Short mmCIF file of C-alpha atoms and ligand atoms in Angstrom, two decimals:
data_model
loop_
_atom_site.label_atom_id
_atom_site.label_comp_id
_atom_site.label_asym_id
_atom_site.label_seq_id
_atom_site.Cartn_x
_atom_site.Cartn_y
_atom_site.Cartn_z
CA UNK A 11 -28.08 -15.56 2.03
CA UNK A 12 -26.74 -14.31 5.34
CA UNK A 13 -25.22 -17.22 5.99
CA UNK A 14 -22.34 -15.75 4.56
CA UNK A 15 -19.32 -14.66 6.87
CA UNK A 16 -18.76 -11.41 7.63
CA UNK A 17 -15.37 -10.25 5.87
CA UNK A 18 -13.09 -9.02 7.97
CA UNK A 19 -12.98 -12.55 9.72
CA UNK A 20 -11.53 -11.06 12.93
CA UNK A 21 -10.27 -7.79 14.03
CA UNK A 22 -6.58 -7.90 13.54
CA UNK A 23 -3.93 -9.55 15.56
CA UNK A 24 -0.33 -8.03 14.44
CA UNK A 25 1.14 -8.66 11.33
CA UNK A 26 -0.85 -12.20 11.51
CA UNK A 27 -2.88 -13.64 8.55
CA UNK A 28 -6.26 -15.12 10.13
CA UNK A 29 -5.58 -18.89 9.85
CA UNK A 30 -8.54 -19.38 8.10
CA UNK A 31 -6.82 -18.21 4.43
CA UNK A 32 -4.93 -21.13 5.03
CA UNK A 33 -8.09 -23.61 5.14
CA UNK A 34 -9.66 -21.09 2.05
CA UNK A 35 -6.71 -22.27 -0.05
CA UNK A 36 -6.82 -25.74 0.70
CA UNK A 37 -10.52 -26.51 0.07
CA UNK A 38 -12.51 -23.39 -0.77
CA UNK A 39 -10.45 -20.62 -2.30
CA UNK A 40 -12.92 -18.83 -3.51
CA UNK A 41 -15.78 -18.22 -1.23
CA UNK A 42 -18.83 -15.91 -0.77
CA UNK A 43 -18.84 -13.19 2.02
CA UNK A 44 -20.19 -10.07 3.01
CA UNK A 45 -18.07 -7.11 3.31
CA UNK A 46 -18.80 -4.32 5.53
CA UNK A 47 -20.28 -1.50 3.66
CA UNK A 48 -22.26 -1.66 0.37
CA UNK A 49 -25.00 -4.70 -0.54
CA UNK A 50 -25.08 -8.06 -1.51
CA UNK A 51 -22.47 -10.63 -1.17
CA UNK A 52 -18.95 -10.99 -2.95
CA UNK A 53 -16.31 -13.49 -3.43
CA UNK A 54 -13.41 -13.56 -1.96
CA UNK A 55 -10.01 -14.88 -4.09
CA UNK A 56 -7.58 -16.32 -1.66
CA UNK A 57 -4.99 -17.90 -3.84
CA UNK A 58 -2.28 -16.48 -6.44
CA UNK A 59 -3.49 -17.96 -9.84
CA UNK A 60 -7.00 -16.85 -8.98
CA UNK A 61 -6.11 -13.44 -8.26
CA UNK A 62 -4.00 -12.95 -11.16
CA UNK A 63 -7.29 -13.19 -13.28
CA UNK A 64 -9.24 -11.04 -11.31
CA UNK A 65 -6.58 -8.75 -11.24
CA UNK A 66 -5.49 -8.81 -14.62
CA UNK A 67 -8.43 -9.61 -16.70
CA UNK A 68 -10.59 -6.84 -18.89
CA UNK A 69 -13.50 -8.87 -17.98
CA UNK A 70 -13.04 -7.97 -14.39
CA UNK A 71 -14.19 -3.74 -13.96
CA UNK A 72 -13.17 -1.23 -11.05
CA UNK A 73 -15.48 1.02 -12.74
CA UNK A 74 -18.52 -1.24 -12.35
CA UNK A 75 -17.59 -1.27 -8.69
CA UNK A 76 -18.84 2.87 -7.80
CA UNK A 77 -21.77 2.00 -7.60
CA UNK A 78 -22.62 2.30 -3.95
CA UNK A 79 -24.63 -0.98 -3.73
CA UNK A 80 -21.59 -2.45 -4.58
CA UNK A 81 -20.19 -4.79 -1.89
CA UNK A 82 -16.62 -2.48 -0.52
CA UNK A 83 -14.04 -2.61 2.03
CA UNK A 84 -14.63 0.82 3.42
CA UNK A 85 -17.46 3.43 4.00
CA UNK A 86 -17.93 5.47 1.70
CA UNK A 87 -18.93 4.47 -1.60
CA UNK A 88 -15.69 4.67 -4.59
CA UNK A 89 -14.71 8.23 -6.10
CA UNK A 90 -15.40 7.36 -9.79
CA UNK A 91 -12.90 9.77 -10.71
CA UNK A 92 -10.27 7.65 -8.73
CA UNK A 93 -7.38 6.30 -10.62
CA UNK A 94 -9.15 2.66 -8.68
CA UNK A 95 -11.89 3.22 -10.50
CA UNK A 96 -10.97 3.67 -13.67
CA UNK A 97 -10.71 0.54 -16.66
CA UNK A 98 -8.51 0.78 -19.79
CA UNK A 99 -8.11 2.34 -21.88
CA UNK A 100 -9.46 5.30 -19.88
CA UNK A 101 -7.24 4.19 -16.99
CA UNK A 102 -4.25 3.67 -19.37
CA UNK A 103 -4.53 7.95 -20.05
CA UNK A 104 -4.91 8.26 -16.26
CA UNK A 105 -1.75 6.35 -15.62
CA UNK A 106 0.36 8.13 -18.50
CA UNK A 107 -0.33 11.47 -16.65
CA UNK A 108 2.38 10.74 -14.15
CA UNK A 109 3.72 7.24 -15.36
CA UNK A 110 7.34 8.68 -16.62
CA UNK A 111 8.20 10.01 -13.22
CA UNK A 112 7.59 6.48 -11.25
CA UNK A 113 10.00 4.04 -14.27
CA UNK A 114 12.32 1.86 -12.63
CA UNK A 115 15.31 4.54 -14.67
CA UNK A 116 14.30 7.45 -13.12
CA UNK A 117 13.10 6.09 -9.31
CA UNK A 118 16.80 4.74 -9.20
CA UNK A 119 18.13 8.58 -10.21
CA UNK A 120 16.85 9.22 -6.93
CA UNK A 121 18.33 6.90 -4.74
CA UNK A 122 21.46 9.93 -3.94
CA UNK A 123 19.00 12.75 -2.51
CA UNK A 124 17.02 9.26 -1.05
CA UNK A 125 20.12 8.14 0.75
CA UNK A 126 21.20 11.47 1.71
CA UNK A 127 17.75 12.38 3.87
CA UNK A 128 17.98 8.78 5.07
CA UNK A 129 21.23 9.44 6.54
CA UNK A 130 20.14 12.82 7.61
CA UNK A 131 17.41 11.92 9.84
CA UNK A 132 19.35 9.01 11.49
CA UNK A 133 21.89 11.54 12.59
CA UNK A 134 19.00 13.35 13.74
CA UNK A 135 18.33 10.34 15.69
CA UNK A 136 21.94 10.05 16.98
CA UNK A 137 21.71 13.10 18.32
CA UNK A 138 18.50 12.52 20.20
CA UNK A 139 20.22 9.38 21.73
CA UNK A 140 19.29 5.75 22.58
CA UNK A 141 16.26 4.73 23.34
CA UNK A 142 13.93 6.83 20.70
CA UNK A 143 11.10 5.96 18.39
CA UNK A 144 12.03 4.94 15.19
CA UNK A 145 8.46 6.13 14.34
CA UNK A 146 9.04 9.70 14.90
CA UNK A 147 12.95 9.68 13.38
CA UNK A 148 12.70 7.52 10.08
CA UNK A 149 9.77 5.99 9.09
CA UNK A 150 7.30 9.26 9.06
CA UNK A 151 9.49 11.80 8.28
CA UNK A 152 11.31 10.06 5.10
CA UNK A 153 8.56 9.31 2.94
CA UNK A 154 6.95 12.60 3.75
CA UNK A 155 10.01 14.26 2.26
CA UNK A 156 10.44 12.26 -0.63
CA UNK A 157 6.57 12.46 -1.70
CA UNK A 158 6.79 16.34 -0.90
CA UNK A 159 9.72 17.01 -2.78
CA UNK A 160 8.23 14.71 -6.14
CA UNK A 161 4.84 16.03 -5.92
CA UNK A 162 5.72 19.60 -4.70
CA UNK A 163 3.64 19.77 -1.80
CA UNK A 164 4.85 22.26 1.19
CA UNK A 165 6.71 20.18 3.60
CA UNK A 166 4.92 22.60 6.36
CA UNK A 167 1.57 20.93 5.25
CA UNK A 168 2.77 17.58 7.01
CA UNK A 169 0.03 17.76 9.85
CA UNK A 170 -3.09 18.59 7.11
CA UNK A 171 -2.27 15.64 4.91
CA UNK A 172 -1.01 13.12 7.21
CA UNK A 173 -4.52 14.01 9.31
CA UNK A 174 -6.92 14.00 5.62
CA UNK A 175 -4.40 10.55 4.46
CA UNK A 176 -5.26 8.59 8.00
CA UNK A 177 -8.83 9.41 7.46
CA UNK A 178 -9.36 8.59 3.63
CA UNK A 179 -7.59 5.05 4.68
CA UNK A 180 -10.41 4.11 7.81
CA UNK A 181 -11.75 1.27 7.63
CA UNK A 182 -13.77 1.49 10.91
CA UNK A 183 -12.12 4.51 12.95
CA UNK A 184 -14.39 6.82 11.01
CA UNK A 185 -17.95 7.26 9.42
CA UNK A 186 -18.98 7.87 5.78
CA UNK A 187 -19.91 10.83 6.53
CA UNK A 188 -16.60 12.10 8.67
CA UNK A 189 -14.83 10.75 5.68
CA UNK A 190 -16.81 11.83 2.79
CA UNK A 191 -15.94 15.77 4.97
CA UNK A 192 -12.40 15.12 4.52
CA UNK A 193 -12.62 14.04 0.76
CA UNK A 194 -14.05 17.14 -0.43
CA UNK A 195 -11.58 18.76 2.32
CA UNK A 196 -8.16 16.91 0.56
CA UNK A 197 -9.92 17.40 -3.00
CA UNK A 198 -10.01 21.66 -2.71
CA UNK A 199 -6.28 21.77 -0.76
CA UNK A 200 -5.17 19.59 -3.67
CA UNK A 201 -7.24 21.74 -6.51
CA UNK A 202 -5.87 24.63 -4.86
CA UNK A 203 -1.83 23.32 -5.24
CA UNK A 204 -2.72 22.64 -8.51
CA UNK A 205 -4.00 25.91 -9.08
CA UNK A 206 -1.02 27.72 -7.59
CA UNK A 207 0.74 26.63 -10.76
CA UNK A 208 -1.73 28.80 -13.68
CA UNK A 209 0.55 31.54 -14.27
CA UNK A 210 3.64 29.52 -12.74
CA UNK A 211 4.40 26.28 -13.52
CA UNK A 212 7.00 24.06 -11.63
CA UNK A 213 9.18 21.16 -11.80
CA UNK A 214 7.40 18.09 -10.17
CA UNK A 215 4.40 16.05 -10.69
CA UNK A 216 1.69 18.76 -9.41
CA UNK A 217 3.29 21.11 -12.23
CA UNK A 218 2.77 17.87 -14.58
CA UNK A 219 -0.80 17.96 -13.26
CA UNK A 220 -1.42 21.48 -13.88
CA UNK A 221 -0.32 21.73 -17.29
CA UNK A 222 -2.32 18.61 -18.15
CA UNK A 223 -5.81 20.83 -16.22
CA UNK A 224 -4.47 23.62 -19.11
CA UNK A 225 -3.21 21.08 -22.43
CA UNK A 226 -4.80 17.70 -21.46
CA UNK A 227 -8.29 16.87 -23.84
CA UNK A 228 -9.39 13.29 -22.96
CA UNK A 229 -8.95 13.55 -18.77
CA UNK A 230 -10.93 15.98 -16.74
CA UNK A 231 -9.52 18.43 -13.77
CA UNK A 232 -11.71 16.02 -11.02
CA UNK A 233 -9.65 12.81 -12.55
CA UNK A 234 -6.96 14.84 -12.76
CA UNK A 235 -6.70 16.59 -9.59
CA UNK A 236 -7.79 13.42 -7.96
CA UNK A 237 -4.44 11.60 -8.97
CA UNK A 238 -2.97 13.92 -7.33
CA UNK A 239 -4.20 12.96 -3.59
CA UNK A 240 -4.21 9.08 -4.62
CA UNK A 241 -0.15 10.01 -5.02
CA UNK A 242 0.22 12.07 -2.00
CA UNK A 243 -1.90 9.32 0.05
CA UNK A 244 -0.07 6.16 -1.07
CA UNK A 245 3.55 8.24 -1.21
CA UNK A 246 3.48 8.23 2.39
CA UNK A 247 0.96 6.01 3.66
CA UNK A 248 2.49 3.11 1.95
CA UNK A 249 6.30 3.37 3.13
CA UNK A 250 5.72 4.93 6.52
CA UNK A 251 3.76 2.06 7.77
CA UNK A 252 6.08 -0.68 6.14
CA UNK A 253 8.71 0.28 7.32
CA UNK A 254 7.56 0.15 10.85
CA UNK A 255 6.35 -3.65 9.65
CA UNK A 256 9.48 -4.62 8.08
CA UNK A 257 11.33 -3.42 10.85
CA UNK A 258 9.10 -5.26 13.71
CA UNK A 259 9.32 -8.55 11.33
CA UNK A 260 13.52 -7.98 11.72
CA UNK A 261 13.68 -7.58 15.09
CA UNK A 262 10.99 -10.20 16.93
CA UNK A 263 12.95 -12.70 15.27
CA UNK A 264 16.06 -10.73 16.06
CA UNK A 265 18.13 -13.64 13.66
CA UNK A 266 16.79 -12.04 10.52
CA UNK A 267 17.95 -8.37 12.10
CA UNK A 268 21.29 -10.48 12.29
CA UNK A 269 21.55 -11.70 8.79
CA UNK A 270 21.43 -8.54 7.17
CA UNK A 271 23.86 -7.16 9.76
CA UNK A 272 26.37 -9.91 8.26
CA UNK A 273 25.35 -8.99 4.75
CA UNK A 274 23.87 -5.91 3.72
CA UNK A 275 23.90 -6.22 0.01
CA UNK A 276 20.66 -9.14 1.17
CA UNK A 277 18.54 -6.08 1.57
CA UNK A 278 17.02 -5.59 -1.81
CA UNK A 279 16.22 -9.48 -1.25
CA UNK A 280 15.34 -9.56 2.32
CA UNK A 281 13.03 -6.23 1.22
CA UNK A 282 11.04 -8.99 -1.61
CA UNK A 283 10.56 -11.28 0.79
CA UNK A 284 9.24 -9.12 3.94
CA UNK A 285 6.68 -7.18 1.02
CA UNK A 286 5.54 -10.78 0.25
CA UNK A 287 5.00 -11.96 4.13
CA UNK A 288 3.32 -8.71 5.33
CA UNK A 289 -0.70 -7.98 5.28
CA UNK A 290 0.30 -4.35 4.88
CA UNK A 291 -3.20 -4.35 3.25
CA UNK A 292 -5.64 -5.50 6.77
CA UNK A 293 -7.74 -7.34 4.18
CA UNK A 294 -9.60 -7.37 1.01
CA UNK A 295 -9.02 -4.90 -1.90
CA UNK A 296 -10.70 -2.70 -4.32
CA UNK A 297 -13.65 -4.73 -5.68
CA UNK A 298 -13.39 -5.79 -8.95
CA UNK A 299 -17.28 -6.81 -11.04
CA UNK A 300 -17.05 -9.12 -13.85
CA UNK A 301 -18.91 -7.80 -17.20
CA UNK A 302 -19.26 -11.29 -18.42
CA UNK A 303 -18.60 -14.73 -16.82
CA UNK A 304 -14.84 -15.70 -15.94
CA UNK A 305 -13.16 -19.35 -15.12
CA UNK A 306 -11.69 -19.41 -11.53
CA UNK A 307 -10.01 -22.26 -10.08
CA UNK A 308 -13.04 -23.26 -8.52
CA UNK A 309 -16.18 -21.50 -9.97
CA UNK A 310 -17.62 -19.12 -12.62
CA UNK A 311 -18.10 -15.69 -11.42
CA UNK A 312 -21.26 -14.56 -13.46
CA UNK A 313 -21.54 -10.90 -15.08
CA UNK A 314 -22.24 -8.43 -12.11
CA UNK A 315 -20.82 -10.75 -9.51
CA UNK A 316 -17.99 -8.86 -7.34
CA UNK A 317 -14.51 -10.21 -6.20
CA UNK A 318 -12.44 -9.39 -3.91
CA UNK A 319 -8.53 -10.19 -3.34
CA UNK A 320 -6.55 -10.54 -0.27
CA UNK A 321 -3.05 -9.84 -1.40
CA UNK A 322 -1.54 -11.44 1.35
CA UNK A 323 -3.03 -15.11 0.89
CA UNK A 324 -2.14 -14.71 -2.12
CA UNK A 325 1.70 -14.22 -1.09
CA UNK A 326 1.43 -17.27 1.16
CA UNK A 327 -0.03 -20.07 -1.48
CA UNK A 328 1.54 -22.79 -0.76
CA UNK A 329 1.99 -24.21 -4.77
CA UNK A 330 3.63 -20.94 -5.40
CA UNK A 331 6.04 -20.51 -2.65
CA UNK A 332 8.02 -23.25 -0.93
CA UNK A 333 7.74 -22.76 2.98
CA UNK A 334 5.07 -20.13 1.99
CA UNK A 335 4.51 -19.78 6.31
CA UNK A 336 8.88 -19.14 6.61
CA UNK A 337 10.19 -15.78 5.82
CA UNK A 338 13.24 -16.98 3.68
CA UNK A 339 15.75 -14.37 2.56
CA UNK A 340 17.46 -16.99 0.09
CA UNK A 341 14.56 -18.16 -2.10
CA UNK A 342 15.63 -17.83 -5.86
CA UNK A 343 11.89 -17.24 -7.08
CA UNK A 344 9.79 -14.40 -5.05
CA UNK A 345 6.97 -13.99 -7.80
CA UNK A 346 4.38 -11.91 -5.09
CA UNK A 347 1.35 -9.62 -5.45
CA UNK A 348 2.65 -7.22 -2.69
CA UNK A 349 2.19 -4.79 -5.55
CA UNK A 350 -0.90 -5.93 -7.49
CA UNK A 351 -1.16 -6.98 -10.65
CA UNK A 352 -2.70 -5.74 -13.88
CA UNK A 353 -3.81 -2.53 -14.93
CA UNK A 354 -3.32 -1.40 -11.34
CA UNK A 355 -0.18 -2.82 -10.03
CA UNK A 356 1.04 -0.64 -7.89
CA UNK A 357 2.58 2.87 -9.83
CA UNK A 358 4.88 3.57 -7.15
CA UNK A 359 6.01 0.39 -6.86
CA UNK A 360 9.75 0.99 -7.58
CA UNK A 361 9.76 4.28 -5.51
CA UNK A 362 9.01 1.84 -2.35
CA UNK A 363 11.76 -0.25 -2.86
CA UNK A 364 13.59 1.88 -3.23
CA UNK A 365 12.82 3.96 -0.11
CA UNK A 366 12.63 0.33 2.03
CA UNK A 367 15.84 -0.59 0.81
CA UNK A 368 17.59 3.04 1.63
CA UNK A 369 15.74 2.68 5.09
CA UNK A 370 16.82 -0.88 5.73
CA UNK A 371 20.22 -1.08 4.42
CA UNK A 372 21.43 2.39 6.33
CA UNK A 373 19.63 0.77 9.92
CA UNK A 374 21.18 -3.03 9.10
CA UNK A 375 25.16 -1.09 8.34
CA UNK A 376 24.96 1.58 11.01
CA UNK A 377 22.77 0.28 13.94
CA UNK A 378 23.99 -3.35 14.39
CA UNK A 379 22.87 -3.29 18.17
CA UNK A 380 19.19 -2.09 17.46
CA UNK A 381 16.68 -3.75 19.13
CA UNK A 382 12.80 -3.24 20.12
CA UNK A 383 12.96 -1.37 23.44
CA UNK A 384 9.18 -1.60 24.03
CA UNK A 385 6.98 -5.02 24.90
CA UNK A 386 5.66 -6.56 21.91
CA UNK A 387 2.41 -6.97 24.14
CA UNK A 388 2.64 -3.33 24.29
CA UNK A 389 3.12 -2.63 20.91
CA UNK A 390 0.52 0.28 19.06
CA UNK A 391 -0.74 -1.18 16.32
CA UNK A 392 -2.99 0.92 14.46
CA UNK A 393 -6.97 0.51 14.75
CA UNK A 394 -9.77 0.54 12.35
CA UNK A 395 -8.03 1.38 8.98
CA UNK A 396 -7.33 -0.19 5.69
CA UNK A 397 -3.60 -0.84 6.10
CA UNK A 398 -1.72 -2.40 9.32
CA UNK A 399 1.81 -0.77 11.01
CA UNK A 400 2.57 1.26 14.29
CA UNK A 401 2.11 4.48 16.11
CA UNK A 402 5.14 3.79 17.80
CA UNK A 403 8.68 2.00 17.38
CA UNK A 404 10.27 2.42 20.22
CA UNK A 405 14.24 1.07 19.47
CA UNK A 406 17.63 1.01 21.76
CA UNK A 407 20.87 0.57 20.27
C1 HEM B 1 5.64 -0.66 -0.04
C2 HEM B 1 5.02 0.27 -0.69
C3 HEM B 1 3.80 -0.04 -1.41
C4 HEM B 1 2.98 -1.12 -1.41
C5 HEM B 1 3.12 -2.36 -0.61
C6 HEM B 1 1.95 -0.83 -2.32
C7 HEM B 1 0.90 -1.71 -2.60
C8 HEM B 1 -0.04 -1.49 -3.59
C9 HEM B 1 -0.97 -2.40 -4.08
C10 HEM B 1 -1.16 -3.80 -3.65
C11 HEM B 1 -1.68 -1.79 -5.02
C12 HEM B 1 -2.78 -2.41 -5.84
C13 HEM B 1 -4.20 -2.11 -5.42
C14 HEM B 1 -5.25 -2.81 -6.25
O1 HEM B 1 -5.09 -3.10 -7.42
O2 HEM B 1 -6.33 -3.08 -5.78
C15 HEM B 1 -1.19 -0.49 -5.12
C16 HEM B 1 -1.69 0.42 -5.98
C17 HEM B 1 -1.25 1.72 -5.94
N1 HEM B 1 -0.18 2.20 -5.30
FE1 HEM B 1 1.00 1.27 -4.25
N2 HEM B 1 2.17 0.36 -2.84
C18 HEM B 1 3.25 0.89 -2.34
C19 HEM B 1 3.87 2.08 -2.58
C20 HEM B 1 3.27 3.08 -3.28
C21 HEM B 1 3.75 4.35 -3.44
C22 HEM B 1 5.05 4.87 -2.90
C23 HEM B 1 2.83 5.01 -4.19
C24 HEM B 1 2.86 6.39 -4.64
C25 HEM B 1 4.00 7.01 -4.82
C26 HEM B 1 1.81 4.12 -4.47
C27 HEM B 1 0.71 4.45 -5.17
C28 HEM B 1 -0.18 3.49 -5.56
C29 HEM B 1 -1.27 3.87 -6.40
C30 HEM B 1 -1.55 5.25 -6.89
C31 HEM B 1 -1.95 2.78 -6.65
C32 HEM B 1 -3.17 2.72 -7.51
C33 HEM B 1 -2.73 2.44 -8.93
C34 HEM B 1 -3.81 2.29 -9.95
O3 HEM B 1 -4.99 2.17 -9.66
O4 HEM B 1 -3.52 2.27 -11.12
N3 HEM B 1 2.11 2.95 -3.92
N4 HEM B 1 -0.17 -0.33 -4.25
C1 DEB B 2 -9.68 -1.62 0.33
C2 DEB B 2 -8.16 -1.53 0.44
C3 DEB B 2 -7.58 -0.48 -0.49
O1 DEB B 2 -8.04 0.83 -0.10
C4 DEB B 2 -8.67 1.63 -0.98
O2 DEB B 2 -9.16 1.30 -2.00
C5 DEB B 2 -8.77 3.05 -0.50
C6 DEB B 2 -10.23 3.40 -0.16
C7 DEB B 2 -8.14 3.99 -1.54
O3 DEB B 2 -9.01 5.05 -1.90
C8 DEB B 2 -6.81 4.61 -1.09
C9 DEB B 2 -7.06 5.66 -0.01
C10 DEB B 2 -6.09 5.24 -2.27
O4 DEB B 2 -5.43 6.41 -1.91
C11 DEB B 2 -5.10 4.31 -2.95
C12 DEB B 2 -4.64 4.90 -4.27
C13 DEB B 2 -3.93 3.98 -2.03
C14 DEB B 2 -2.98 2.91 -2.56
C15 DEB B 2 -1.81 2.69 -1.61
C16 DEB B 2 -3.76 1.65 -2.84
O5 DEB B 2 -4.18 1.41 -3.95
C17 DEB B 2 -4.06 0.70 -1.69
C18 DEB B 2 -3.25 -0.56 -1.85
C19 DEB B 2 -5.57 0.41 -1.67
O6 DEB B 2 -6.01 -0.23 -2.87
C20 DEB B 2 -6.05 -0.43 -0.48
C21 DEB B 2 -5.49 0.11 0.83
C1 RAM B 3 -6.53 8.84 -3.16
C2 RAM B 3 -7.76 8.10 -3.62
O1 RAM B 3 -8.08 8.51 -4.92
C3 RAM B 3 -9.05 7.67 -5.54
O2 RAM B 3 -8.55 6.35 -5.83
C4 RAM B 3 -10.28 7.63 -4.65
O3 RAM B 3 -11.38 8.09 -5.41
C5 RAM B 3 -10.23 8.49 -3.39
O4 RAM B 3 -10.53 9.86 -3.65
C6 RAM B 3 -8.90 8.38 -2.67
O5 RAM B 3 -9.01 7.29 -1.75
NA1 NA B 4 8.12 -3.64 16.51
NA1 NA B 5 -14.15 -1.27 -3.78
#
């Protein structure tokens, strides 16, 4: 059987979704293909029902999925102590580690010190004049900060775990082996944080950590340790890049820029509906293996057969969402997967609201003249990785 497509269907184009989802959902939503690394074939789940099972069902395993015959997105094969990779009620544990600090109660206790390094860095950006690159002012350094200051990671390590966070998120760019380097690389800097805090325990999630490598009787330090760079990967990687998306989606269409100019309390809104529009994820997910057969809209997965989800198609199904192809900022229903679903939705979930909403609503109220001041041809969309946004945002005002 390799007359199966190759997943990926095309090197990226933008923020675009490959046209074919569309067809997918119409009259094959879910369909076999061949990802790029591991063996075999999987299927792929293109529309929202069908990826709420696989998603959200015990019958579906991340665990099942380390196995390095198993069909995957990138090269090497999963970290079984990942938080990815784990099921419940193993993964449950995992989660609980951390869980308290990432509630929707105490993400919102940080929106002051959030606002107050938003506003910050755009004076920092003032100061530097028109044009600059909104890249280098906001959307890098603010989510850097925030994750450094909840984990308790040195700010001045910015350069080692930006560099060890592009590389654990290749797609392409790198090799297994180049990234396998780097794994044990970010695995003994982030032991070795955690370590700092034997005879000295602190105040943020790494001292959480620490005391759980000391207390802790069901999770091991590797599973432990290891939640620890998924947090300090996705704390950054996540908002740095989506705000550079959000931002381009605002200001190509420079009417949507324009409506939240008018009326900045749309934001939180306007935020739900960009999430739901953008492929921040280039394609596919974490595989998930059924352990006995499941019901999809269109087939039955059998027991060892692997899924895959992209999040995006999923966010543009048409029986879902009215004008699924529109980005509407009024829709009274905005029920989208831009977060998961399941055991793994998303932990930080509420933490990148509320940092896309602090970014957004200070650009929309005190930059009502910004506009891209760089070709859209032009524009430096990043290569050969796992998630889509820019290099570069180069803005006038
Ligand atoms: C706009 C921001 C974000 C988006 C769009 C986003 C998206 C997602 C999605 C779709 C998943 C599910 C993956 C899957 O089940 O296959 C996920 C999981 C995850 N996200 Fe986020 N995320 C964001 C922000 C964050 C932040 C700020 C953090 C950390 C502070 C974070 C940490 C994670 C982690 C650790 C997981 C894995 C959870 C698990 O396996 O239980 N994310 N994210
Ligand atoms: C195949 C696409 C997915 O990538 C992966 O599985 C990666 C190999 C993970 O190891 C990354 C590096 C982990 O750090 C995650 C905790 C990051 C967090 C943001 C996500 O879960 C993210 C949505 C992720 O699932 C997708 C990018
Ligand atoms: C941060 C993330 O953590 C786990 O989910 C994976 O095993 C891997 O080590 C890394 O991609
Ligand atoms: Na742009
Ligand atoms: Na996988």
């Amino acid at each position: 059987a390799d007359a199966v497509p190759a997943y990926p269907f095309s090197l990226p184009h933008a923020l675009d979704l490959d046209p074919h989802y569309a067809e997918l959902r119409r009259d094959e939503p879910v369909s076999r293909v061949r990802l790029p690394y591991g063996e075999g074939t999987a299927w792929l789940v293109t529309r929202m029902s069908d990826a709420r099972i696989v998603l959200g069902d015990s019958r579906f395993s991340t665990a099942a999925a380390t196995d390095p015959a198993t069909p995957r997105m990138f090269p090497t094969p999963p970290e079984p102590d990942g938080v990815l990779a784990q099921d419940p009620p193993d993964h449950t544990r995992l989660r609980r580690l951390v869980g308290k600090a990432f509630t929707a109660r105490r993400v919102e206790e940080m929106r002051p010190r959030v606002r107050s390094l938003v506003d910050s860095l755009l004076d920092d950006m003032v100061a530097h004049g028109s044009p600059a690159d909104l890249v280098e002012f906001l959307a890098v350094p603010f989510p850097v900060a925030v994750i450094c200051e909840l984990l308790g990671v040195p700010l001045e390590d910015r350069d080692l775990f930006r560099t060890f966070s592009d590389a654990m998120l290749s797609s392409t760019r790198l090799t297994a082996a180049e990234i396998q380097r780097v794994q044990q690389d970010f695995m003994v800097y982030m032991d070795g944080l955690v370590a700092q805090r034997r005879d000295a325990p602190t105040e943020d999630l790494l001292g959480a950590l620490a005391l759980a490598t000391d207390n802790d009787d069901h999770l091991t330090k590797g599973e432990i340790v290891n939640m620890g760079v998924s947090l300090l990967i996705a704390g950054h990687e996540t908002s740095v890049n989506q705000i550079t998306n959000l931002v381009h989606l605002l200001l190509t269409e420079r009417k949507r820029y324009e409506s939240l100019v008018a009326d900045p309390a749309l934001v939180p809104a306007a935020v739900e509906e960009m999430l739901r529009y953008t492929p921040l994820v280039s394609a596919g997910s974490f595989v998930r293996v059924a352990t006995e057969d499941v019901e999809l809209s269109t087939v039955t997965v059998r027991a060892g057969e692997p899924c895959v989800v992209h999040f995006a198609s999923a966010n543009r199904d048409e029986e879902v969402f009215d004008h699924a192809d529109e980005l509407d900022f009024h829709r009274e229903r905005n029920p989208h997967i831009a977060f998961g679903h399941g055991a793994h939705h998303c932990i930080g979930a509420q933490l990148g609201r509320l940092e896309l909403q602090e970014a957004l609503s200070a650009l929309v109220r005190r930059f009502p003249t910004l506009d891209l001041a760089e070709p859209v041809a032009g524009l430096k969309w990043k290569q050969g990785m796992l998630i889509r946004g820019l290099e570069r945002q180069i803005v006038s005002w």
